[PDB]
């Protein structure tokens, strides 16, 4: 499956792609404003994620740091990134279908659209100014808007027991972005696509 990753932000981002225990394609790359990077993701990939990292520095060996979404200091991510990170999430070729969503469960850093480039399903988008409107207690000093689990580490926010409800904090994310997951047990906003669809992830789709 091909994913074209497009940076429409006015600032540079460092795209990342991982399934948690391995890189997808090269795992990461710098995208200047306007740049597009196309990666290939193996069919059957379960629990894949794509995200943006901001304010990164890497040396010539590809080691460094990012202010949001850092994946163990690597340019080429092999693991998931440090919150806050808006997440494009996907599982491919699962009994004949693909499943896609956007999630704010790990917070929000950069607005995103995640859409198929092939027929048979709709895209999803979370492009509101979540960082600008972020509740004081969730603001990440390093940049972005943290999820409540990251900030407070309670069973209720982290849904540790599989029993949790919406919260004042989850409702903030849901109000700004109805089409993204706002907490673990949120009413799903997952889209079912034909198996083996192709996709485009666009950062800052409306600006």
Swiss-Prot record:
SUPFAM superfamilies associated with the record: Osmotin, thaumatin-like protein
Disulfide bond in keyword set: yes
Main subcellular location: cytoplasm
UniProt similarity note: Belongs to the thaumatin family.
Entries under PROSITE patterns matching the protein: THAUMATIN_1, THAUMATIN_2
Disulfides per UniProt: 9-204, 56-66, 71-77, 121-193, 126-177, 134-145, 149-158, 159-164
Function of the protein: Taste-modifying protein; intensely sweet-tasting. It is 100000 times sweeter than sucrose on a molar basis.
Organism this protein belongs to: Thaumatococcus daniellii
Protein keywords: Cytoplasmic vesicle, Disulfide bond, Signal, Taste-modifying protein
Superkingdom: Eukaryota
A single GO cellular-component term on record: cytoplasmic vesicle
Name of this protein: Thaumatin I
InterPro entries xref list: Osmotin/thaumatin-like_sf, Thaumatin, Thaumatin_CS
Compartment annotation: Cytoplasmic vesicle
Keyword field contains Disulfide bond: yes
